[PDB]
Amino acid sequence: TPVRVGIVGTGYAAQRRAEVFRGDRRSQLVSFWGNSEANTAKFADTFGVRPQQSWQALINDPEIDLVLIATINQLHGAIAEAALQAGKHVVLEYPLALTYAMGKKLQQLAREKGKLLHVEHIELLGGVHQAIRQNLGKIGEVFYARYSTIMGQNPAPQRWTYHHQQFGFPLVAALSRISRFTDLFGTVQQVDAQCRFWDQPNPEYFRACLATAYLQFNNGLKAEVIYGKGEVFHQNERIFTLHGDRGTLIFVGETGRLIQGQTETEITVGSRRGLFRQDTEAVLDYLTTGKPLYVDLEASLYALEVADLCAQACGY
Ligand SMILES: NC(=O)c1ccc[n+]([C@@H]2O[C@H](COP(=O)([O-])OP(=O)(O)OC[C@H]3O[C@@H](n4cnc5c(N)ncnc54)[C@H](OP(=O)(O)O)[C@@H]3O)[C@@H](O)[C@H]2O)c1
Ligand SMILES: C=CC1=C(C)/C(=C/c2[nH]c(/C=C3N=C(/C=C4\NC(=O)C(C)=C4C=C)C(C)=C\3CCC(=O)O)c(CCC(=O)O)c2C)NC1=O
Ligand SMILES: C=CC1=C(C)/C(=C/c2[nH]c(/C=C3N=C(/C=C4\NC(=O)C(C)=C4C=C)C(C)=C\3CCC(=O)O)c(CCC(=O)O)c2C)NC1=O
Numbered sequence: 374t375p376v377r378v379g380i381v382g383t384g385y386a387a388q389r390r391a392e393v394f395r396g397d398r399r400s401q402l403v404s405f406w407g408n409s410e411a412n413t414a415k416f417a418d419t420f421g422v423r424p425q426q427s428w429q430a431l432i433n434d435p436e437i438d439l440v441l442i443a444t445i446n447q448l449h450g451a452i453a454e455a456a457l458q459a460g461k462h463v464v465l466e467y468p469l470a471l472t473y474a475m476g477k478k479l480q481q482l483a484r485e486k487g488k489l490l491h492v493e494h495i496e497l498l499g500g501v502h503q504a505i506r507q508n509l510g511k512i513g514e515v516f517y518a519r520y521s522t523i524m525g526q527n528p529a530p531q532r533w534t535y536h537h538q539q540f541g542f543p544l545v546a547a548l549s550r551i552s553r554f555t556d557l558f559g560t561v562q563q564v565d566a567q568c569r570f571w572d573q574p575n576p577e578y579f580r581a582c583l584a585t586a587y588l589q590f591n592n593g594l595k596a597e598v599i600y601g602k603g604e605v606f607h608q609n610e611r612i613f614t615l616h617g618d619r620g621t622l623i624f625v626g627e628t629g630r631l632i633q634g635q636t637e638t639e640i641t642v643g644s645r646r647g648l649f650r651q652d653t654e655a656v657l658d659y660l661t662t663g664k665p666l667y668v669d670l671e672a673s674l675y676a677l678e679v680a681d682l683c684a685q686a687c688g689y
């Protein structure tokens with residue numbers, strides 16, 4: 374300490390990190406690596422840091438102790454691996470990797486190098502998920518559950534989140550959909566999935582995708598995971614429904630209600646706080662005082678495992 378940080382990426386997540394790292398006594402933002410020249414210059418000017426020429430040069434820099442990986446999904450695996458070999462602590466924005474196999478390597482590698490390997494999961498710090506668990510008890514045995522997120526976007530940009538290789542399998546990239554269910558109900562017994570893309574004229578990109586996963590949990594629960602975004606969607610949704618034999622929990626965006634006997638009581642849901650700030654501090658609290666992190670790497674790797682299985686169910 375101060376934990377000297379190099380940041381890989383200059384996007385939204387990378388900026389929230391820079392803000393907290395800088396403003397936090399225990400940490401020192403040292404370097405960063407980006408992509409486009411404009412945003413590498415914006416990031417450098419905004420935060421007072423100079424950019425490495427390559428991410429390889431960033432992770433080998435002896436004057437950083439921790440690599441923060443907030444770049445495109447496709448690069449998570451190789452960069453996390455190179456940084457662990459180079460003896461750095463590695464914090465990643467999810468997904469850990471684009472395949473379950475690669476994530477297992479990183480876990481094993483980080484173990485045998487004695488370095489922190491943490492995957493951020495801000496969906497587990499949000500109002501919806503905390504309210505779901507504040508209230509899970511009073512709806513009995515959850516037998517039927519669905520989480521639909523539909524993000525219509527017309528036109529679809531030819532940015533990295535619509536690129537097959539850089540984004541990866543959509544349910545691997547949108548790991549927070551499955552992660553929620555595994556955090557609440559544990560091991561999945563059975564996996565069925567379908568994915569369908571609408572290509573761009575340049576088919577490296579897609580203008581839309583619909584990914585559906587049908588999960589059967591060991592404890593009897595049936596769960597539906599619906600992820601869709603792009604040009605063919607005309608109605609947005611962010612709906613989490615949980616049917617128990619004692620009641621129903623429904624969360625529509627950030628509003629929640631408990632439903633018992635065909636009647637509903639409103640549920641208070643927490644503010645859209647700096648979830649990135651919570652995570653950053655959780656990392657700095659763990660590295661200094663040993664306070665356990667709010668999510669385990671094991672749980673993150675398990676979410677990827679279920680998601681990787683969804684990618685096999687789709688032939689992908
Ligand atoms: N709330 C969140 O945003 C959120 C939450 C959870 C996890 N994550 C994880 O965030 C990582 C960062 O995502 P984001 O949401 O911050 O996206 P973003 O704002 O688009 O930032 C991505 C960074 O992408 C770099 N980049 C883009 N294309 C690249 C390429 N082809 N090769 C190398 N670098 C490239 C961007 O380049 P330019 O300089 O060209 O912009 C910039 O440096 C992903 O794992 C994302 O899923 C994000
Ligand atoms: C408007 C553009 C916008 C972009 C480009 C964006 C990127 C983005 N947001 C994500 C999750 C998330 N993104 C946010 C919040 C934000 N993220 C933001 O970029 C911004 C500006 C906010 C909020 C003002 C949250 C809370 C999650 C967690 C979602 C969850 O709980 O599942 C993810 C991870 C993959 C996924 O779950 O789909 C990405 C790539 N989010 C956006 O809202
Ligand atoms: C042009 C606006 C706008 C867009 C394009 C948008 C889309 C959007 N919201 C996302 C996550 C998210 N973004 C937010 C929240 C916000 N997001 C915000 O832009 C703001 C101000 C909040 C404020 C709370 C949330 C809650 C998610 C949750 C996960 C989801 O809905 O998929 C993602 C995930 C990553 C991806 O696959 O690209 C996208 C595209 N939301 C938008 O509001």
